[PDB]
Amino acid sequence: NITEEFYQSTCSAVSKGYLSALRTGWYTSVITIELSNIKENKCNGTDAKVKLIKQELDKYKNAVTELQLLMQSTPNRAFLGFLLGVGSAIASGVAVCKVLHLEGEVNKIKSALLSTNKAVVSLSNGVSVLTFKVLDLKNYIDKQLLPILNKQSCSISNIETVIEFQQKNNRLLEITREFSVNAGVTTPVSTYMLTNSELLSLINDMPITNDQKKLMSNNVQIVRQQSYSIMCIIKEEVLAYVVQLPLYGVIDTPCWKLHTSPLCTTNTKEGSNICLTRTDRGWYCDNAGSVSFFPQAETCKVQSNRVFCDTMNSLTLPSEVNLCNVDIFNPKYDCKIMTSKTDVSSSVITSLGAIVSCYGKTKCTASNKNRGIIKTFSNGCDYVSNKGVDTVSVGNTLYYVNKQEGKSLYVKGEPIINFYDPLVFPSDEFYASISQVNEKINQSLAFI
Amino acid sequence: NITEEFYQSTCSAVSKGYLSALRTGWYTSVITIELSNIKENKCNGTDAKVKLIKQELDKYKNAVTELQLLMQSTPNRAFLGFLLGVGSAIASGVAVCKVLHLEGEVNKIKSALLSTNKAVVSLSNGVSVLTFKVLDLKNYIDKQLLPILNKQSCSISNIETVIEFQQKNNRLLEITREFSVNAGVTTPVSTYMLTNSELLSLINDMPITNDQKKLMSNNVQIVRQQSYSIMCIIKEEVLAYVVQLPLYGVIDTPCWKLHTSPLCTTNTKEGSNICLTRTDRGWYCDNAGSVSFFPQAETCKVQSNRVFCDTMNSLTLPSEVNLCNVDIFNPKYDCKIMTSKTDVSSSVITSLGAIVSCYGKTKCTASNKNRGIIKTFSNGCDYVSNKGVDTVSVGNTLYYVNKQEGKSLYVKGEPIINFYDPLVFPSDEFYASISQVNEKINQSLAFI
Amino acid sequence: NITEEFYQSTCSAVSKGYLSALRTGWYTSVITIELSNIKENKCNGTDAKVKLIKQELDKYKNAVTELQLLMQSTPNRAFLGFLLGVGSAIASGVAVCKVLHLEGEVNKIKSALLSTNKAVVSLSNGVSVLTFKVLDLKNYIDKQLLPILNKQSCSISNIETVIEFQQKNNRLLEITREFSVNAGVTTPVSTYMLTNSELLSLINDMPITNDQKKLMSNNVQIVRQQSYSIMCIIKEEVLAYVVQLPLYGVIDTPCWKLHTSPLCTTNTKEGSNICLTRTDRGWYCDNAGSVSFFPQAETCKVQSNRVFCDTMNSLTLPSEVNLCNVDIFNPKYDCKIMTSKTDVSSSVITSLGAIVSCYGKTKCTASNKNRGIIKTFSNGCDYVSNKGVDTVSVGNTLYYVNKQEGKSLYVKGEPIINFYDPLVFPSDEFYASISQVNEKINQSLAFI
């Protein structure tokens, strides 16, 4: 299942065995809350029950006023992470919102949700959206509160009506609160925006495959984090916002994680040493004949052995980029490195073990809870599997290794940094490539 | 109104037509909650109403204890973003807090807010601050709860008093909760800290121009995000915190966004290619005879065509920096570039279109929802306006273009990367300048 | 106490006098909520009191279902910050969770918390954990609600029971809500997860020194921010999560902050100027014979003169690294610099003053509130202490200086950038070292 290879020659390790789930699409549903047009009334009733009702009705009216004032606002430019392109993530969402502002378009929805709280409506721009009514405050305030306020004055008050209205009104107040401190766009989508039972019901009614229905349902928390809640409009007794859900159009393709660490010579004199680091670390997933590379592997969520990623955070590379692992000098692909005198010690915890880059006088060991040091690392880049090992210590820093099971393969090889004459080594390329470095080396070697 | 130019020669695009709103100042108001000095009482009453009261009174007492324990704490060092200076953002706030700790100074405020809940008080350090009393728990617990607890024992309990106290006490509990997980400083300022109606009332009573009053009021959500809430003190039946609001001392000056993307030769052999990227991307705003440059354009909030920015996230540059757009080789300003073999494909969505840097074998197209591919990009850097275009596809990644209307201008020109001999091109300067590169080029050209 | 030195020769300043508190360990406690196995009942009672009860009981049942669906999920790869290693921070926590899944292991805990709500239990993996029962919903729903629902139908309803159950059930609902939008791991640990009074009680019962008990208690907010809350399991009427607290195994060692800024020549022609910046800025703490260096000083929390840091965000360096401050050319340590033509003006606010790097035509001054400009900076890198100074202005940006008291020392010296011939200066090393630069200089000087 999940296995791992360490390449001694380049101080890198690849964890493989993973399966992809890459977001490639967006499903945009419209969540609605039916509001009520209430004008406050001349009501002379001291009784504290009525007073509490009116205090809650003010909360309601202020939440609406706040959301309206907010909807004047309607709703960028961001180791190889700078290489990423730039795009807006809520774009299909904002697209749907702009349609909802068209005259007559809100009326279309409330008519669909007149006899049911869940329906599929066709918008004038021709997208079919699932529409939910999740909270009907309209008829509640009208057929529960409104008569008490008006008919025969405030005399007929009931404490269970006070408590019930607090409960009903609360979701509106928390919806508003979230939107107010996020300028109208929310992520992850909270359970206020969409409850667990609602989200699941949404997924079951989507135009997605029976396969995808199962996948999204068994990972709702990941779905929430990759979803957006976009405040859209308040119009004609209706509050509406778009919940924008991830479609995973790439599933169960092979994924592997590349871990890299600095590779340095370990000469007696520590200021005559040269270093080299593979710069292409992160997640890789086979995808439509090419490879999707995610430079900031912190953007992918890993569940078991499935990797949930957003394709907006990837570069698309030739599949030949994998040859950098097995042969960094290959002719098919120019493998990326930096040459920056990073002779500082560190560890990188991998899926099934740990890479240790130990230099200078740093203490670098791997331990077991009950048995003490079982491996001492020497100067250089090395590796230990998580089998029998609990912690890794480099200097004053303690790392815990993952204890998930899997096979590790130590691929012995000569550290490639040894192939270079320190006197002509391009000693500071922040972002270079193997052949690029070889080029400059010869260029200065010609000066003889 | 909003227009855009693409410069083919340098693979960059400038969106202009924007108007500035740059924070240059801070208004520091003092928000107060009047507390009560209650000692719990020997009260033998089982009745569940009283029990619920005492459970809420414990919540109150614990919120106070927590805030006091917190106020022992009272309240850094952070594409050209590293060039930014370092300063504390809550400094004028902390300044006001330190004054509130002076003996007699808290008493000055509570006296001002004795007959009203909104007043302007002059502090001993000579700053005039607007002061609000937003919650008077003191006289509530004293003249609603305290007698019930003591006088004639617990016999006189009332359920509407239970529910009302939960409501009153809640804001205190949420104020506390926020402060407790943020070490006393909050941003964005929540509606617990300052309600929508309060914030607006604050803005109307400030010593700012009638112009600025309108601007801040019509963008309260942006104001919230650029505001700070600083827990200050609990002293003499008073809880006080400072809400620190942005003053926009630069308004309606021209702003433009610079978008850049990698510019590479597209020779048959893909490992003999050289690249070049303008590194000066981000927001630019005319400001006091110079230009305020914001390197991380993700720090500015754009509302319609107004750009809200904080001047602490800007560098101050000569106005001549704009000449980099129209003539990157000009003598007046040394235009910044990097030369790092970024021959990986990507897109940058702009305000009115899209830049596409297409290299290697990557599929790069622009599509329309209903009509399919309408433009196919060739190897190189190119551009397409958002007119008639819905999406842009580079490799496995899909971008949506903005659909706001505006004029786009394609400025044809020779890609400047073509002017360089690949044999002497300084092939890895992470942060260089045009003339810097020309210098090194000649330096190695002299070796002949 | 807190003092500071500015080194004119290298445009850097060191603030010292600080005392360390470095996290080196983790204490993992198990927080438990006792749940109840309730099957809903055939109850024909319209009365609104009962209706509200059943609505709250549904909230309870849905919170449990949600947490269970979440626990299918169970629970990386991240100026010198890239040099940091990579490790999982919740590892000892996840370790404890995996043990709690073992059969019989949950039963061990609930038996310990059968007669008390706080006990120390020994897990089968041999770790002694403090275990809390913080909410006993089991016997509440059973001996308060369950009979009302069943026995003699719904006739016996009581409003104080409605309100009380809302209160009891609320913590569960907020625990769930937090976990649901964070995939099961929370930080900072909220007061829902662990109340202020609970956290403190935990600290008092830990196997830590009387010294450490005092330290953690007087800084609970820092403890919260450096803690993790890990959703673990729902099994046998028990909900359990791990709260993972920082152990500070390094305390009261000397800490100092290094501030650096760009150092450039200021020749008449501004495009013939060379620059140099020390790249080793951030926090430094003596630690076990070496120095713990934190490259992103934004990761350390400073309280008074104590510095709270996590050792996972540090590199371990020789103590000789301090010699870079007093003599950047020393033979013992190769001091790190960049040489990147950063001739853009800026300020860095320090602990007791301000560094100003002023270049070009930028206006750079230091002011006092009431007295105006008291210092004007010239082209170059300079410094001013916070004594008598309120603000610093560089270009269009205004900085506030800290007003804490302490001694500042201006160490005069020749700017080292003056020692270099601009014609052979390696004008763009993003991450180099003094001797590295000297090397390349001679290498190109040999070509004569």
Side-chain angles (χ1 to χ4, degrees), chain B residues 121-141:
Chain B
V121 66
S122 298
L123 306 182
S124 69
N125 71 331
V127 51
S128 276
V129 298
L130 264 163
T131 311
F132 284 1
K133 177 148 69 175
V134 297
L135 184 63
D136 191 18
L137 285 183
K138 182 181 99 69
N139 84 317
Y140 179 82
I141 305 190

Side-chain angles (χ1 to χ4, degrees), chain A residues 48-50 52-54 56 59 137 140 144-145 148 157-171, chain B residues 52 159-164 166-167, chain C residues 48-56 59 158-167:
Chain A
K49 287 172 183 176
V50 169
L52 297 183
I53 296 296
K54 285 173 176 178
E56 274 295 332
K59 290 183 177 178
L137 285 183
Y140 179 82
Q144 221 69 40
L145 306 184
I148 282 178
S157 55
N158 174 261
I159 197 61
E160 300 98 28
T161 300
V162 185
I163 288 180
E164 190 178 17
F165 181 40
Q166 279 169 10
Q167 301 287 306
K168 304 280 264 73
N169 191 45
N170 170 72
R171 184 172 188 183
Chain B
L52 297 183
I159 197 61
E160 300 98 28
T161 300
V162 185
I163 288 180
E164 190 178 17
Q166 279 169 10
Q167 301 287 306
Chain C
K49 287 172 183 176
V50 169
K51 179 175 178 177
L52 297 183
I53 296 296
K54 285 173 176 178
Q55 289 173 7
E56 274 295 332
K59 290 183 177 178
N158 174 261
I159 197 61
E160 300 98 28
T161 300
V162 185
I163 288 180
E164 190 178 17
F165 181 40
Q166 279 169 10
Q167 301 287 306

Side-chain angles (χ1 to χ4, degrees), chain B residues 194-213:
Chain B
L194 213 58
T195 69
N196 215 71
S197 47
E198 284 162 354
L199 170 61
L200 288 176
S201 183
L202 230 182
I203 300 181
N204 187 39
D205 297 329
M206 289 178 202
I208 67 172
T209 177
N210 39 333
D211 312 340
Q212 273 213 59
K213 283 180 179 182

Side-chain angles (χ1 to χ4, degrees), chain B residues 59 77 86 287 311 431 436, chain C residues 167 260 349 396-397 427-428:
Chain B
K59 290 183 177 178
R77 200 86 202 72
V86 172
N287 186 349
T311 41
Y431 176 60
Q436 200 176 337
Chain C
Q167 301 287 306
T260 67
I349 300 291
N396 294 340
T397 300
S427 198
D428 258 327

Side-chain angles (χ1 to χ4, degrees), chain B residues 299-447:
Chain B
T299 66
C300 298
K301 293 83 159 51
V302 178
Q303 295 262 257
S304 183
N305 67 340
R306 189 169 309 275
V307 183
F308 290 86
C309 285
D310 190 307
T311 41
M312 261 296 311
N313 297 319
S314 64
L315 304 169
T316 312
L317 304 179
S319 57
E320 283 86 4
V321 75
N322 194 31
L323 294 173
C324 292
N325 298 316
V326 335
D327 183 23
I328 201 168
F329 292 108
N330 80 309
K332 291 268 191 179
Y333 191 93
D334 200 6
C335 300
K336 299 300 177 304
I337 66 174
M338 65 172 315
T339 63
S340 278
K341 190 66 192 297
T342 303
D343 58 340
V344 56
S345 303
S346 69
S347 180
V348 172
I349 300 291
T350 68
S351 299
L352 296 172
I355 302 177
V356 178
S357 287
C358 203
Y359 302 108
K361 307 175 166 293
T362 314
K363 185 178 171 69
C364 308
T365 57
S367 277
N368 170 281
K369 199 207 312 304
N370 309 114
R371 288 188 300 262
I373 315 297
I374 48 185
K375 186 184 181 56
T376 298
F377 299 99
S378 304
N379 261 5
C381 169
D382 203 352
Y383 171 88
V384 57
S385 65
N386 61 356
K387 189 182 192 298
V389 175
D390 292 318
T391 60
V392 158
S393 275
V394 174
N396 294 340
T397 300
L398 180 106
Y399 313 83
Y400 295 86
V401 300
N402 300 320
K403 296 259 71 181
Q404 76 167 320
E405 201 179 15
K407 339 164 192 156
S408 285
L409 186 62
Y410 199 108
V411 184
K412 285 175 168 180
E414 164 100 285
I416 66 165
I417 191 66
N418 287 336
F419 298 148
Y420 296 94
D421 176 32
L423 295 183
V424 289
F425 189 73
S427 198
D428 258 327
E429 325 246 329
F430 215 84
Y431 176 60
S433 71
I434 285 301
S435 68
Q436 200 176 337
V437 164
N438 285 351
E439 190 173 359
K440 185 184 272 74
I441 286 174
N442 285 11
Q443 185 192 22
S444 47
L445 235 38
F447 304 140

Side-chain angles (χ1 to χ4, degrees), chain A residues 130-149:
Chain A
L130 264 163
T131 311
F132 284 1
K133 177 148 69 175
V134 297
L135 184 63
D136 191 18
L137 285 183
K138 182 181 99 69
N139 84 317
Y140 179 82
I141 305 190
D142 292 342
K143 83 203 289 186
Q144 221 69 40
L145 306 184
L146 214 156
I148 282 178
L149 290 173

